């Protein structure tokens, strides 16, 4: 569960980095709260074009 960010956020906030977050942190808060999204190897290209 690496995911890519969206806004700032915690000790990793950056509007679009590849972090390595804990899954529960990921698929219970950030994504449902729209602060990140999974890095599904398709996603590692849209925020790897900027």
């Amino acid at each position: 569960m690496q995911v890519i960010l969206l806004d700032k956020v915690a000790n990793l906030g950056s509007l679009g980095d590849q972090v390595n977050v804990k899954a529960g942190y990921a698929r219970n808060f950030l994504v449902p709260q729209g602060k990140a999204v999974p890095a599904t190897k398709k996603n590692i290209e849209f925020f790897e074009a900027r």
């Binding site: 569960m1 899954a23 698929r27 994504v31 449902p32 729209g34 999974p38 599904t40």
Partner: protein, 77 residues
């Protein structure tokens, strides 16, 4: 029923075995939980009775796919 809506995991029967190998019937049943999942693609939460792994699948494949299944298969949800 204790069936994982994602994997179809259900209880399975096996044995106990003592140090003397006495067999006593028993069941392994799955690590169910039931969990509010955000879809966004429907602006709603859906509670699936899900196994861990069921979760780990949803993590990987991603919800909507999994939801294509279930619906593809007829699961209520």
């Amino acid at each position: 029923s204790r069936v994982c809506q994602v994997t179809g995991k259900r209880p399975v029967t096996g044995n106990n075995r003592s140090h003397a190998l006495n067999a006593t019937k028993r069941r392994f049943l799955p690590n169910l939980h039931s969990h509010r999942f955000w879809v966004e693609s429907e602006k709603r939460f859906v509670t699936l009775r899900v196994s861990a792994k069921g979760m780990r699948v949803i993590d990987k494949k991603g919800i909507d796919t999994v939801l294509a299944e279930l619906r593809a298969r007829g699961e209520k949800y």
